[PDB]
């Protein structure tokens, strides 16, 4: 019953440039002169995608920027170079004997020049304060890094409880990340306030990013 | 050319045996070994078993020897699967996949049928309209937004235009809390294009039947 022990488990690299990920089973995975070792692309929402068979066979309809090597136990996935849709968590499979054993996975993220969020407030709905529920909510758009600090401020005073976070996947054109921010509250508590912020602490600036709105206006 | 036919989601009872299906085409289903994958959600992958249609002779991982049982019907080319006794261990995508001919790789795949094991209730979801702040545009965009509130199970699709508006769009990940989804998704277009063009979200939760589109007003 064989381990396969996957490094690293997530790998930043730039475009253009080389990946590689490996593998180590716990026993040999070859039978007469083949290595039973195969790769695997996973994209979010998809199946695992097959990159490379038997070690080293470029799957069809799969670009030659992939390649694998290796034989016994230890084994080498290659993508050379980068380009912006290899986002993905990436699996090793062996094939030599059952239970059929998977790789923990590596993640790719891609490297790519520092840019600034677009921040975007949202008072709630007309419809949603018929609920007496209400939401805020903030988008930060297209940034990177991924590191990103929000901060929700009531009538000029910061609050904690009551928010909850939301992150996209790494965009697979443009490398960037987003997130949406919301602060529900009761319709009640809503309406005993009349300014609302969301600010945004990023890499790209040493001043936050303040959007904001007073009720009513 | 081969197709593996797996239905995209199932609501189960905690306890309750469900039945997951794998149809088959584009090939003959008698001569492939067929195996099944579960994957836990943001997890890695397991192998639970495999099945030779033209005989029915099976392979379990030891892992899922009284949780598993695999069938095939060889007239309708449909593989099964039965979770006995389910529980929210239970809950996952499960895959299924069939090797290449003359080969031990897995090469074709289904989209996995996404299992909820769970008691709760299944919910409809609201859609509120986010439109922009008060006061003039300043900058070349506009961003605009649709927030989907306290649904109950997954999935929920979400479009924007009947889908004709598909760039510069975020739909983000659901969150759970108690037992209710919350999604919300936003679009940014050219500050010249509305509100002279219409901005619509339309929005699907299958499990309750509902199909809204909203209209983002000023």
Known sequence: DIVLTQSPASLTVSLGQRATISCRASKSVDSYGNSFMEWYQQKPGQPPKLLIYRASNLESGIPARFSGSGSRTDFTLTINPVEADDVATYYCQQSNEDPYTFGGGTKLEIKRADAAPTVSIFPPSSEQLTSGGASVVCFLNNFYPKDINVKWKIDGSERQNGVLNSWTDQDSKDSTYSMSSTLTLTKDEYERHNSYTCEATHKTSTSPIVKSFNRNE | ?218
Request: with cysteine.
């Open chain 2, 1 to 218: 050319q081969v197709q593996l036919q797996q239905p995209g989601a199932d609501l189960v009872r905690p306890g309750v045996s469900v039945k997951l299906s794998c149809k088959a085409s584009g090939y003959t289903f008698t001569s492939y070994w067929m195996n099944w994958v579960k994957q836990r959600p943001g997890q890695g992958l397991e192998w639970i078993g495999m099945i030779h249609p033209s005989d029915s002779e099976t392979r379990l991982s030891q892992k899922f020897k009284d949780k598993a049982t695999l069938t095939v019907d060889k007239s309708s080319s449909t593989a099964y699967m039965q979770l006995s006794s389910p529980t929210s261990e239970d809950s996952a995508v499960y895959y299924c996949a069939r090797l290449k001919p003359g080969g031990t790789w897995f090469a074709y795949w289904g989209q996995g049928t996404l299992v909820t094991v769970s008691a709760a209730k299944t919910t409809a979801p609201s859609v509120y309209p986010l439109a922009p702040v008060c006061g003039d545009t300043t900058g070349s965009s506009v961003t605009l937004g649709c927030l989907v509130k306290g649904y109950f199970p997954e999935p929920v699709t979400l479009t924007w235009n009947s889908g004709s508006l598909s760039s510069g769009v975020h739909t983000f990940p659901a969150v759970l809390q108690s037992d209710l989804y919350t999604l919300s998704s936003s679009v940014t277009v050219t500050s010249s294009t509305w509100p002279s063009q219409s901005i619509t979200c339309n929005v699907a939760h299958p499990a309750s039947s509902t199909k809204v589109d909203k209209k983002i007003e000023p």
